[PDB]
Amino acid sequence: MKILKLQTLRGPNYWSIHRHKLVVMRLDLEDLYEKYTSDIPGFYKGLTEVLPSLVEHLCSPGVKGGFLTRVEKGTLIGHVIEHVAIELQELAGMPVGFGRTRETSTTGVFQVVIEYENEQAGRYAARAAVRLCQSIVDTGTYPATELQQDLEDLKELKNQASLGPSTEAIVKEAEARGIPWTQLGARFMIQFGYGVNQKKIQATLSNQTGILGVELACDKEGTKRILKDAGVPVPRGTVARYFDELQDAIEYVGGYPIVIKPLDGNHGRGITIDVKNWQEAEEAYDLARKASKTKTVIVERYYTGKDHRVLVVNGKVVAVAERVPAHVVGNGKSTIAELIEETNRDPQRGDGHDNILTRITVDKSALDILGKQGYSIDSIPLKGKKCFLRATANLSTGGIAVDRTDEIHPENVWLLSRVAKIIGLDIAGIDVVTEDISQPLREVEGVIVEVNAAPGFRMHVAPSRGLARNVAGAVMDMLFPGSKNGRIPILSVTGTNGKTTTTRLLAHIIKQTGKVVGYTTTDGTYIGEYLAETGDNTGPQSAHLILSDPTVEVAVLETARGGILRSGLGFSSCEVGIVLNVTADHLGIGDIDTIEQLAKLKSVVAESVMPKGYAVLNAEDPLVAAMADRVKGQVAYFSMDPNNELLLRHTEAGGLAAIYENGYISILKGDWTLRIEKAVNVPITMAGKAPFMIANALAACLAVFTQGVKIEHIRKGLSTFVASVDQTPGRMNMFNMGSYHALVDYAHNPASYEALGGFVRNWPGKRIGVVGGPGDRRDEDFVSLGELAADIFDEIIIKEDDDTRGRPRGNAAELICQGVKQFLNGIKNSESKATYESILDETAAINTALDRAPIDGLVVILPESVNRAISLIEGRH
């Protein structure tokens, strides 16, 4: 076994839709290629003793233990490998239930697809499955120590790539509302929505949470001063840094009892709660001073009453929880000694940062605290009354929370909303000390102890003594007020031969409307009028740049098959999904070997259209038109032939099609025809000479029309879009230098070659052509390119791309020469005797083409890089 390639899919992909997280591996079965499990000695027993849990795999039999029966009858090792990967990452607590195995075109390599929950965990499970199976086939068993090591590694990977419970809850709510979410790579920040409609959270702080409010909340004395200036009942306190100031401060606060705490600390380090005389105040002051990071200590009046935590979101009180400290009740005539471990044996209690109820930790400090209680270990509680173990009233110690949201007085709700607004926090956690939350804080001597930014709502979604509150729902309501997701209109263009031109035309048409358009094409990624990134930029890694930009209002993405194969789609759904054509030209790349597979791959865009969205399909292409079914949302057809029976039948019942009827780009809305332009006033069509450009224009116009763009804007965008170097880098570019003309294009496959010929053959001048193709394509494609170039052109100059993609140098050139020779030998008389010659350098090829251009001739260039041809023709004026 040898792992040849390991890819991870994060969106809708070729293998599945709605199963976004997948991992696909090319596994080489060098020696066990046709060895079934029944033909491997001792394989079944070793496998079933290493992992008995496989008995739960309801395989193709569909019954409990069916996979075991499949192994019994003899099965290929790829199937057991995918199953062992599923079970290996399932034992680590990660439920996954998708798996596939396929035979590739090459002899000994399989493709194995495993569902994952964590990317690193999924890759690790895929890598470990083959090692486990190889060890079983070599020795008959797998060591238990290695199995435990692998499970521990998987659990560590799951823990490492995990959000927090607050972020988990908020992300789960956003997913439930259909709002897209992505993980930023900087500071554990999560981005919701797209473009101008996006928001950001870290754990509870949002992108609208103020720096000033957070800093004021972190400052205890500043918060107290601000709240006192606003009439909020804060505790009467003072600060002190030297020993001699203690007596004066205690006089100022109003007597006894008092509270001594540090200015800065964590988990209540060195905070005394209740002191009533001198000496204990002195030791508490010493402890707090040695616990504070700045030697300074708050001393305030002690206020009796229970401790409540009030959560305020968007100025509204969402949840109120009373914090009861760790305690036991002897109502069953049992004392502390039994109950301390009786409570610890309850499944609700747990450690870590997931189970909120913690075990009652009997610390030495806790022993001292229960010493101050006035009772002992075996002292039975009187009458069955609460007896406490600590006084901090915190969940970490082992206390409980009681829901009090339905009992808070309306005046208290108003006061706490005012406190949150005064501090300046959109989400705040306010600590109140009061004898009764159902009465106003003025009647009882209730006080506001502190205000916390980025509070944890972990005690409100699981009170354990009351009703849970949907805090994540309130946060998501604050982030997205109405029934609004964070989506911007997404238009995904896919197809074999017209993605870039259609994407640019769509971007121009939408730019006619006053909107900022972020679009990614083969040339580069643009936002508005300015280039955001250079390169290929046709995969999800460039779609994320557009979808995360804060200024983009409409996203237009050219979605090539390469990105879908590599890592799937960069988005869950698209508003418009355009499929232009599917031609079997570059077959053999990846697992794609038949045009049916290519159609299935390109259908991912069509099947990703949301139910309220549109799928713009070419009715003239049978494979693309076959995608009409299995598409959620409406279908709109475009056809260059106005008499297409399928399109007419579609328009009769419903509408939303586009045709080219009588020198007119027309939209059919059922029984209504709306003409846009004469198709000779559209510059890219070149006075209607290029039909493929007209098809691209039809697709773009239909796509914008389905989204409500006015006909006037479509007309203006279609008229003002130019097919020259100013806008189109290498798409149908004319260059005129007087004596002749230069056509630079991007043709590299037989379909685009035929489309190019359909326009070149109408030129009345001499036809010189420099042709070529990428080196990673099949030989038959090169032969077809050569024969088509022979058919259409009069002078042939064959060049092979410098980046040959692993193919030996030259081979493609002589095979295109073989194709042109075959076409030449297929002619009896001198009907077309085009001259042929091959030079393998781009500069030499274009120089030779431009050197011997006669009067009124046409020289067509199909270079590896557009910038080379652009610069070469710019230098020569």
Binding site: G164, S166, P455
Partner: peptide
């Protein structure tokens, strides 16, 4: 700090 964090999740106060």
């Amino acid at each position: 700090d964090d999740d106060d």
